[PDB]
Structure 1
Amino acid sequence: SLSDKDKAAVRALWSKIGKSSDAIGNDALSRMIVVYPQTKIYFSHWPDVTPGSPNIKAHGKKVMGGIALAVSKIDDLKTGLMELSEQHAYKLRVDPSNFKILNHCILVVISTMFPKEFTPEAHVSLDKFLSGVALALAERYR
């Protein structure tokens, strides 16, 4: 679980990078689909599922919006993300191994954009937070 120190480092980081969250979400989602092709089946209903794609761009905005929600609900992730856990883990039955993949790609994308701010200290807390997200999303499976 996160410490008040972890919470503060996530808020301060998000404070620094959240301006570019639209580009972060597009980029992180593009990379998950290219580097981890097994994930493309969840978006097979879109006409264009390649990095340029208008659909990836619109949906990455939405995913970074869910992260922004987890940041503001950082003290109770389980309740804050219950609607989203319902959607993924109940309806779409997204296989949870895939949440670690998207989380990895978000870290790569932040590293790519904010190398100076993405220090190892910021990385431990962002990594605990992102695993808290994955865990909150996995709540409704069973």
Structure 2
Amino acid sequence: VLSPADKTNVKAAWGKVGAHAGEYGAEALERMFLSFPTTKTYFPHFDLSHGSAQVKGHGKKVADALTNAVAHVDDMPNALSALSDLHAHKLRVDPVNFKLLSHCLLVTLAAHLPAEFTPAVHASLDKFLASVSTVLTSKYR
């Protein structure tokens, strides 16, 4: 589980993302599509090319969800329950895919937060992202 410190470092790192959340999510995704091609299968109806408005769009959707989660860091199960139902029942994304996108969020994040991405914060974000995935995966079966 997270800790009083994980939570603060999380709120800390995210407050620094600020208004970039949208372009970081898009980047996060781009990195995921190029690094782990198999993930593309879920986005057949997307133009996965660089700069694409769709990725830029979804990425913002994804970042907003996270921003929401950061602020409900002490109550995620219910703060993202709708999203946990969406990915489990309608989309049905294989779970192994969440660890792939989490790894890219971290990368995108490390590439934009030079002074804040410290060994402790990096440890905090990883646990945070693992928890988000755990929630979004809880309704799978």
SS of the aligned residue for 2:111 comes to helix
Task: Kindly provide the CA deviation profile for residues 29-84 of structure 1, in whole angstroms up to 9, marking residues without a partner as x.
Answer: 111111111011111012x1122211000110100001001101111221111100
Q: Residue 12 of structure 1 aligns to which amino acid in structure 2?
A: A
CA distance in 1, matches of 2:28, 2:54: 13
Cα pair 1:33 1:39 within 8 Å, conserved: yes
Tell me the TM-score normalized by structure 2: 0.96
Q: Name 1:26's counterpart in structure 2.
A: 26
User: Are 1:69 and 2:56 matched, yes or no?
Assistant: no
- Aligned partners of 1:87, 1:51: CA distance in 2, in Å? 26
The secondary structure found in structure 2 opposite 1:55 is helix
Partner letter of residue 93 of structure 2? Answer: V
How many angstroms apart in 2 are the aligned matches of 1:10 and 1:27? 20
Compute the displacement of 1:22 (Å).
Answer: 1.3
C-alpha separation between the residues in 2 aligned to 1:113 and 1:12?
14
Whether contact under 8 Å (1:25, 1:60) holds in the other structure is yes
SS at match of 1:113: coil
1:121 and 2:120 aligned: yes
Which stretches in structure 2 are left out of the alignment for 5+ residues? none
Residue aligning to 1:43: 43
Moved over 4 A (4+): none
Aligned residue pairs total 141
- For 1:65 and 1:11, the matched residues in 2 are separated by 14
Contact 1:24 1:109 in 2 (8 A): yes
1:1-142 matches, cutoff 5 A: 1-46=1-46, 48-142=47-141
TM-superposed deviation, 1:116: 1.5
Aligned Cα root-mean-square deviation (Å): 0.9
| CA deviation after TM superposition for structure 1 residue 19, in Å | 2.5
1:103 Cα deviation from its structure 2 partner: 0.5
CA distance in 2, matches of 1:3, 1:112: 25
How far the C-alpha of 1:18 sits from its partner, in A, is 2.2
With structure 1 as the length reference, what TM-score do the two structures score? 0.95
In the alignment, the residues of structure 2 paired with residue 132 and residue 57 of structure 1 have an alpha-carbon distance, to the nearest angstrom, of: 25
